[PDB]
Specification:
Two copies of one chain form a homodimer.
Chain A lengths: L25 H16 L4 E3 L9 E4 L7 E10 L4 E6 L7 E8 L1 E7 L5 E7 H14 L15 E2 L7
Antiparallel strand pairs in A: 1-2, 2-3, 3-6, 4-5, 5-8, 6-7
The complex binds 3-(2-methyl-1,3-thiazol-4-yl)aniline (56K) (2 copies).
The site of one 3-(2-methyl-1,3-thiazol-4-yl)aniline (56K) has 10 residues of chain B, from β4 and α2.
């Protein structure tokens, strides 16, 4: 079932989400299902549970190919100090984008919805997607990470590199 | 004549605008006319020439009542250090607003379009309008001034005080 995505300004995006405690359950599998379906309908590459007003450490993401992934209780570790700049947008902030520095290299861990452990090293766009989605679990959106406000604007208008 | 307002992302918002050198001219009077008309059609309280892609130190503003004012070659001086927070939006960033600290007290100077000198002390919302419009003359938009990103979001969604 497609869920409503809440937009920046909604307090439910600003919460720190608790862990998932229902790995392998039918209730989680359905919620994950709905999230992939919601992500797909909005043409997203990532979506976090709080963007559909569900307060849980859960995100889906994927589609350079990033693997289709559902991830509960994510925890992330930079693998280096190299930052890298890249374009980011967000379905809760429709029509806009900005350039955001993210770690180029991370490891992330947590659990697939059937409860199997997940751990991967990630780089570049894959890395950036997971960091962005992780931010939501923590009440954080990308504008608070912009350093060059010249690169922030509407998508159909922007012309920076 | 109503002009197109350009949106955040357009480089023409990021320029430092040169002075007006045509006070008392028919070309300025028409441009000022168009700006009041453009401001009115968009339900703005302020609009700066670069928001209609005209690169000049010129702004209109007004409607607590703020007097309807056209102002070329604005220069501003805080009258104190008291900052004050207030809600701001911007016609080049439609649908959004944020809380922004501005000086509570300013003096501003420059010229009415007929070339008569203008100087006023200003406080509160009047002050804030002029500071906001002044920012555009200098390539600056309000997001780069947000300190609490919790208060930044879509207007129809937001619920902070
Ligand atoms: C090239 C682009 N990437 C994105 C994007 C980047 C990181 C995270 C999410 N959720 C979206 C928007 S435009
Ligand atoms: C209460 C509000 N004020 C504004 C506003 C405030 C300052 C400058 C401009 N141009 C608009 C938007 S919502």
């Amino acid at each position: 079932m497609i869920r409503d995505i809440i937009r920046m300004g909604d307090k439910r995006l600003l919460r720190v989400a608790p862990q998932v405690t229902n790995l392998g359950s039918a209730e989680l599998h359905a919620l994950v299902s709905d999230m992939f379906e919601t992500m797909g309908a909005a043409h997203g590459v990532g979506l976090a549970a709080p963007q559909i007003a569900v307060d849980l450490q859960l995100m889906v993401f994927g589609f350079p190919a990033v693997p289709l992934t559902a991830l509960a209780n994510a925890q992330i570790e930079p693998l280096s100090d190299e930052m890298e700049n890249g374009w980011e947008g967000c379905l809760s902030i429709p029509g806009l984008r900005a350039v955001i520095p993210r770690y180029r290299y991370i490891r992330y861990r947590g659990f697939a919805p059937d409860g199997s452990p997940i751990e991967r090293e990630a780089e570049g766009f894959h890395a950036r997607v997971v960091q962005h989605e992780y931010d939501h679990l923590v009440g954080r959106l990308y504008p608070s990470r912009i350093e060059n406000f010249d690169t922030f604007g509407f998508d159909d208008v922007l012309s920076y590199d």
